[PDB]
Design an enzyme around this catalytic site. Sequence first.
Site, short mmCIF file in Angstrom:
data_model
loop_
_atom_site.label_atom_id
_atom_site.label_comp_id
_atom_site.label_asym_id
_atom_site.label_seq_id
_atom_site.Cartn_x
_atom_site.Cartn_y
_atom_site.Cartn_z
N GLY A 1 50.82 -3.73 -20.74
CA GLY A 1 49.65 -4.29 -20.04
C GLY A 1 49.38 -5.71 -20.46
N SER A 2 48.79 -6.52 -19.58
CA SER A 2 48.44 -7.93 -19.88
C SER A 2 47.17 -7.97 -20.73
CB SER A 2 48.30 -8.72 -18.61
OG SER A 2 47.35 -8.12 -17.74
N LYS B 1 53.35 -9.39 -28.19
CA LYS B 1 52.49 -10.14 -27.29
C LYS B 1 53.10 -11.52 -27.04
CE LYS B 1 48.31 -11.55 -28.59
NZ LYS B 1 46.83 -11.63 -28.76
N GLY C 1 47.45 -13.17 -23.07
CA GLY C 1 48.89 -12.90 -23.13
C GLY C 1 49.24 -11.56 -22.53
N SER C 2 50.53 -11.26 -22.47
CA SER C 2 51.02 -9.96 -21.97
C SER C 2 51.59 -9.18 -23.17
CB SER C 2 52.03 -10.14 -20.87
OG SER C 2 53.03 -11.09 -21.22
N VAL C 3 51.47 -7.86 -23.20
CA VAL C 3 51.96 -7.04 -24.34
C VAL C 3 53.06 -6.09 -23.86
CG1 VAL C 3 51.33 -5.37 -26.14
CG2 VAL C 3 49.74 -7.21 -25.53
N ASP D 1 41.52 -8.79 -32.23
CA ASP D 1 40.90 -9.94 -31.58
C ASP D 1 39.80 -10.61 -32.40
OD1 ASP D 1 42.63 -9.48 -29.52
OD2 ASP D 1 41.15 -8.71 -28.10
N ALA E 1 44.75 -9.53 -23.56
CA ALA E 1 44.43 -10.78 -24.32
C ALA E 1 44.86 -12.02 -23.55
CB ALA E 1 45.07 -10.74 -25.68
C1 LIG Z 1 40.76 -3.70 -23.31
N1 LIG Z 1 41.87 -4.37 -24.04
C2 LIG Z 1 41.48 -4.71 -25.44
C3 LIG Z 1 42.60 -5.50 -26.11
C4 LIG Z 1 43.91 -4.72 -26.10
C5 LIG Z 1 45.08 -5.25 -26.90
C6 LIG Z 1 46.04 -4.37 -27.39
C7 LIG Z 1 47.02 -4.86 -28.24
C8 LIG Z 1 47.91 -3.88 -28.93
C9 LIG Z 1 48.03 -3.88 -30.32
C10 LIG Z 1 48.77 -2.90 -30.93
N2 LIG Z 1 49.39 -1.92 -30.27
C11 LIG Z 1 49.27 -1.92 -28.94
C12 LIG Z 1 48.55 -2.87 -28.24
C13 LIG Z 1 47.01 -6.25 -28.51
C14 LIG Z 1 48.03 -6.93 -29.34
C15 LIG Z 1 49.39 -6.72 -29.08
C16 LIG Z 1 50.36 -7.28 -29.86
C17 LIG Z 1 50.03 -8.09 -30.97
C18 LIG Z 1 51.01 -8.65 -31.83
C19 LIG Z 1 50.64 -9.40 -32.91
C20 LIG Z 1 49.31 -9.63 -33.19
C21 LIG Z 1 48.33 -9.11 -32.39
C22 LIG Z 1 48.67 -8.33 -31.25
C23 LIG Z 1 47.68 -7.73 -30.42
N3 LIG Z 1 46.06 -7.05 -28.00
N4 LIG Z 1 45.10 -6.55 -27.18
C24 LIG Z 1 44.25 -4.31 -24.67
C25 LIG Z 1 43.10 -3.53 -24.04
#
Ligand SMILES: CN1CCC(c2cc(-c3ccncc3)c(-c3ccc4ccccc4c3)nn2)CC1
Length: 338
Positions: A27-28, A49, A32-34, A164, A30
């Site tokens: 999912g996108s 990310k 950024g995209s993950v 975050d 932050a």
């Molecule tokens: C409503 N949203 C609230 C925010 C959320 C999210 C999940 C993730 C996330 C984190 C861990 N495992 C799965 C997903 C991340 C994210 C992913 C990768 C990263 C790598 C290095 C440092 C920080 C990082 C943060 N960032 N944001 C999505 C849903």
Amino acid sequence: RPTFYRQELNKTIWEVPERYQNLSPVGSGAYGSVCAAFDTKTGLRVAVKKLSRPFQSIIHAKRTYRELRLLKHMKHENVIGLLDVFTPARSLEEFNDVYLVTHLMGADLNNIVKCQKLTDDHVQFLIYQILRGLKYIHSADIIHRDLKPSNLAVNEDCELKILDFGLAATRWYRAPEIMLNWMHYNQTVDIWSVGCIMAELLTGRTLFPGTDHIDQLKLILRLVGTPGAELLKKISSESARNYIQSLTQMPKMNFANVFIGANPLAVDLLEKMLVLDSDKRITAAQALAHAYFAQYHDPDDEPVADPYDQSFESRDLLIDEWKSLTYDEVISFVPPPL
Ligand SMILES: CN1CCC(c2cc(-c3ccncc3)c(-c3ccc4ccccc4c3)nn2)CC1
Ligand SMILES: Fc1ccc(-c2n[nH]cc2-c2ccncc2)cc1
Ligand SMILES: Fc1ccc(-c2n[nH]cc2-c2ccncc2)cc1
């Protein structure tokens, strides 16, 4: 330098070291995209990310620097941390993309509270971990400012991590002094958010589901009462003080009646977090010692953070300089011990 490989995932190009395999869009999330991935070097599932447009404007370049600096500094079990940070660029000239790596977390607190009701024992453990991470964050002079269930990552062991931190109906978790646009709010705004989250885990209902900033404050004052004389003396803004005093007075409700049937230790802690005057709110360190967490509290295992230099926040630099500073931070990254 490792060997990179390229692919397209959801109309987005991902170029990563070959050690990360089996990338699947998650999912996108932050700025950024993950993508979930398999780390062949460790055998662990990771989240990668990719930052979006990291150096498109001075705003983006500075925020990119801020986030990388922040993530590199945090080393705590209840705070999201960096396993790896990389760029496919071989030089600053071609530096244009930044990828961040952390341990894959399965869900967020919102997914858990909505799908199931939580016993008092789980509430203890979840809130304990939030407060333990917050003690660490606050000890570095960092405020989260946007704590909410969706920023709390959790896995099946019920292990929790704050996401975050320190970055950038209306916010049901925001402290009232923020709804009033007080520009000198402090780290206790995060304790207010924890109280709102705790209440929701206990009741299964949003505590303050305001429709806008005005309604949000109204709902808050209905529970905790209108400001007393001590708090009024601290309001400098004339428009704000006039507004507050023009409201019909509201008495503080008794939380033991509002949260009837909750563990009375939980109610006592909520009382201490959801105090209108931010100077009288319990701190994270103090909350960890509260009897509610007697079965998890360990004062020898609740660490503080190293000093964190935020002086860059006051600087006025060019995009190329923020980009160069970020490049430096990528190159100097040292992965944590395996
Ligand atoms: C409503 N949203 C609230 C925010 C959320 C999210 C999940 C993730 C996330 C984190 C861990 N495992 C799965 C997903 C991340 C994210 C992913 C990768 C990263 C790598 C290095 C440092 C920080 C990082 C943060 N960032 N944001 C999505 C849903
Ligand atoms: F954040 C603020 C800032 C100003 C006010 C305010 N001062 N006087 C009147 C108001 C007011 C009242 C109702 N709705 C919006 C604003 C209310 C909230
Ligand atoms: F209605 C309210 C609600 C909250 C506050 C408040 N709590 N902590 C600090 C403040 C505050 C708000 C505005 N200006 C100074 C201090 C003040 C008035």
